[PDB]
């Protein structure tokens, strides 16, 4: 009968006569509540046995006491918020100091020296991002600092930004206040250049999504037509590398539309045309890509990028006779060829045995078992077993439902 | 079942005071009318309407 200890936590078997017990469905163990008992705690509000006494005093202290604030304090805190301009100036100062004191990488021979970790740059980066409403990529900053030329092209831009802000210029804040028209200022241009450098570092690292986000923020900041064209071209290239063909095409079209507002010396228009053509090629519309390349050549004859893309399209056209036509409209996008696409598939791909349409199905905001999926009444669906609720037969078949 | 056919038991210590007896003709014939409470407010008056539930602070 009795083999182990008398306590419920004992392992081996017991008997009703010797050690009578209550029906405890599931209770914690000697080492504290487990994930299952904690799931019961969060869902039912108490452990499944019910003999336990709920005690969430610590949770109450963490949430409700912390978020409680009287009306007067809540009203005066907004008025006593810090000074945005001074806070931004201090953030820029400390960020520049940290970047300057960041050590330079030793160029070892025979192997690649590990780039020193950026511990002290995060907090200055966090405050700078908060102040400017922008989001800087830590990977991009790491790559920029590791590269020597990019490091200088970032430090000079940051110093110019600091100088122009200290001189009393806050272009975003002034524009927002006025809106509550003019062209880009020196401070805004320096900020855009800094963000473009960060995006270039992101591209060198391989973080095309971060590069695209940084360039999008730079575009948001910019207002000059030339800056808009250049930023649109950069965003188109970043989206092409990130496997965002719709975004790349949209940015390229916007750059090509802004073409007239830009002076002849700039190449942003040609870059936008190249990006649009590349997006079309990746979407597998070779006729559209060729037409766009022809238009770009007619606009800027002799552009190196346009010539290279035209040569590549000519090679693809020479290969096409093997197929006797273009890719059929049926698929028109099926093939995937980018490392960004491969990484996305590896991350968000439906794994075998989990994260698939048979493991869990995500409803509006909730997880459901495959049987309860409202997107299909398959043979494993509960919806199949319902039928003829009482209104009408609703189906000709007479065996189930 | 009478006086209990559910889950929540009655509390006889808070039941309304008995006031009469049954009769098949009318229903419940009331005998002890004094048991029933009538909340007759005092008549209106000047100081009465000038008074307010709370007292001001000097």
């Amino acid at each position: 009968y009795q083999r182990g200890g008398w306590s419920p936590g004992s392992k081996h078997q017991k008997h009703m006569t010797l050690n009578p017990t209550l029906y405890l469905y599931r209770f914690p163990g000697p080492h504290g509540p487990g994930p299952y008992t904690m799931k019961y705690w969060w869902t039912l509000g108490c452990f499944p046995t019910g003999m336990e006494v709920p005690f969430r005093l610590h949770e109450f202290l963490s949430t409700y006491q912390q978020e409680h604030v009287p009306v007067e304090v809540e009203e005066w805190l907004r008025c006593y918020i810090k000074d945005p301009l001074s806070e931004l100036v201090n953030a820029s100062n400390d960020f520049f100091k940290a970047v300057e004191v960041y050590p330079e990488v030793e160029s070892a021979r025979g192997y690649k020296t590990l780039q020193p970790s950026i511990a002290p740059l995060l907090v200055p980066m966090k405050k700078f991002e908060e102040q400017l409403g922008v989001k800087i990529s830590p990977v991009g900053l790491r790559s920029v600092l590791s590269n020597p030329v990019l490091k200088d092209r970032f430090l000079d831009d940051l110093f110019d930004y600091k100088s122009y802000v200290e001189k009393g210029g806050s272009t975003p804040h002034r524009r927002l206040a006025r809106s509550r028209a003019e062209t880009t200022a020196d401070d805004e241009r320096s900020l855009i250049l800094l963000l473009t450098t960060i995006s270039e570092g992101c591209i060198n690292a391989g973080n095309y999504s971060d590069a695209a986000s940084v360039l999008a923020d730079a575009l948001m900041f910019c207002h000059d037509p030339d800056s808009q064209a250049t930023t649109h071209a950069n965003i188109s290239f970043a989206s092409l590398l990130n496997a965002d063909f719709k975004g790349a095409e949209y940015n390229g079209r916007e750059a090509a539309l802004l073409q007239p507002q830009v002076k002849p010396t700039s190449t942003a228009c040609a870059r936008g045309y190249v990006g649009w053509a590349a997006a079309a090629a990746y979407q597998d519309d070779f006729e559209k890509a060729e037409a766009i390349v022809k238009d770009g050549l007619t606009l800027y004859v002799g552009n190196e990028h346009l010539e290279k893309l035209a040569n590549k399209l000519q090679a693809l056209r020479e290969e096409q006779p093997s197929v006797y036509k273009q890719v059929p409209r049926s698929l028109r996008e099926s093939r995937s060829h980018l490392p960004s696409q491969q990484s996305r598939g590896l991350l968000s791909g439906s794994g075998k045995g989990f994260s698939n349409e048979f493991d869990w199905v995500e409803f509006k905001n909730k997880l459901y078992p495959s049987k309860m999926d409202p997107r299909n009444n398959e043979m494993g669906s509960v919806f199949r077993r319902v039928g003829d609720l009482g209104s009408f037969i609703s189906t000709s078949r007479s065996m189930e439902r | 079942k009478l006086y209990f056919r559910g889950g929540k038991p009655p509390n006889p210590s808070v039941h309304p005071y008995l006031t009469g007896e049954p009769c098949p003709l009318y229903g419940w014939k009331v005998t002890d009318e004094s048991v029933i409470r009538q909340f007759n407010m005092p008549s209106i008056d000047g100081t009465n309407f000038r008074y307010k539930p709370y007292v001001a602070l000097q």
């Binding site: 698929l331 093939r335 995937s336 060829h337 980018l338 696409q341 491969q342 598939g345 590896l346 075998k352 | -």
Partner: protein
């Protein structure tokens, strides 16, 4: 159910081959040319292109 076992007596199973085949196997895979997801040969998706042509 007659006597306790020692660590080596328990490790005999990992010495064996059935344990390795059941637990210590590595799957060979590749990136699908269409969806660019990890994929094992012989198994495909329910997408129309995958059904029509099976990578």
């Amino acid at each position: 159910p007659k006597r306790k076992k020692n660590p080596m007596q328990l490790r005999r199973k990992v010495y064996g081959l059935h344990f390795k085949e059941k637990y210590l196997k590595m799957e060979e895979w590749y990136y699908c040319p269409l969806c660019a997801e990890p994929k094992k040969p012989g198994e495909w998706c329910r997408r129309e292109d995958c059904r029509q042509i099976k990578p």
